[PDB]
From a paper:
Under stress, USPs are overproduced and through a variety of mechanisms aid the organism in surviving in such uncomfortable conditions.
The best-studied USP protein MJ0577-ATP from M. janashii contains a typical ATP-binding motif, which is composed of the following residues: G127-SH-G130-(9X)-G140S141V142 (where the superscripts indicate the position of each residue in the sequence). This motif corresponds to the following residues in [name]: G114-SH-G117-(8X)-G126S127T128, suggesting that the N. europea USP may be able to bind ATP. Our structure of [name]–AMP confirms that the protein can bind at least one molecule of ATP analog per monomer. In the [name]–AMP structure, a conserved stretch of nonpolar residues (as visible on summarizing multiple sequence alignment—Fig. 8), followed by D14 and also strongly conserved S/T residues and V42, form contacts with the adenine ring. The first three residues from the conserved motif (G116-SH-) contacts ribose and the T130 residue binds the phosphates. As a result, we obtained the structure of AF0826 with dAMP bound in the vicinity of the ATP-binding motif.
Numbering used by the authors:
A (entry chain A), B (entry chain A): 2 to 42, 51 to 116, 125 to 147
The structure:
């Protein structure tokens, strides 16, 4: 196996579908473990007169992550929902998890180009229908 | 096969060796045809009092291209030695030849980042020992 651990980064756009079945086949053909990441991305002040729905908001993010994770057969131990700047957190989890190929979509300043610039491992940029 | 035609771009540096055996294995594992490209890169005035060795110069470039092409079993019909700007010519041959994955090394303004920005196909950036 040329690569043993692929991290797929998904932004939950319409575009993801292309990369999902492609990455599923790639991982199989080269014999790599898949992990999955989605980054959650008076501005520090919290509204006092309205009810918050942060738990419903997060659950929606979890369900989209799980739709894809289930399709790819990725154990929930290797699915990542993190908050932060996409480029930073994608590279952080890649390094933390011993990933050797990061897969990102590409249509700035873009996420693909930023991950390329800082990645300590190989990067696959799947050209998306922008 | 997720990809049917991989174009490997080589700059003839010490760094190429990493990408060559990696790309050889990748192409085999995913079942893709390999092509290979190296770009040749009073400034328009030609010296009159010295003998030129442009043919020896080109032959050296051909031998380095052929060392790699022979290793990868690439038919000389699919090896490319072109003059121009690397990013432009790499994308030009990719498009001309119906390539679906371009492989480049990555350590600006870099070639990897430029090919990413203009590529109409997927791009693999192999992280080099800079
Ligand atoms: N919040 C995010 N979580 C995970 N991946 C992302 C995120 N935003 C962007 N990406 C990656 O970057 C690609 C294109 O994003 P962008 O350049 O931000 O439009 C997406 O297909 C993902 O691969
Ligand atoms: N003259 C060239 N011909 C083919 N590929 C090149 C050339 N220059 C740069 N590259 C590609 O870009 C990578 C890094 O180049 P650079 O960013 O120019 O240092 C190399 O490993 C090649 O993949």
């Amino acid at each position: 196996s040329v690569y043993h651990h692929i991290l797929l980064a998904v932004d939950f756009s319409s575009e993801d579908s292309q990369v999902v079945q492609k990455v599923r086949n790639l991982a199989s053909q080269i014999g790599a473990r898949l992990s999955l990441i989605h980054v959650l991305d008076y501005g520090t002040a919290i509204p006092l007169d309205t009810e918050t729905t942060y738990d419903a908001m997060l659950d929606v993010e979890k369900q989209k992550l799980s739709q894809i994770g289930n399709t790819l057969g990725i154990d929930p131990a290797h699915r990542w929902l993190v908050w932060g700047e996409p480029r930073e957190e994608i590279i952080r989890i890649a390094e933390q998890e011993n990933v050797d190929l990061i897969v990102v979509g590409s249509h700035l300043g873009s996420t693909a180009n930023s991950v390329l610039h800082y990645a300590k491992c190989d990067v696959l940029a799947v050209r998306l229908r922008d």
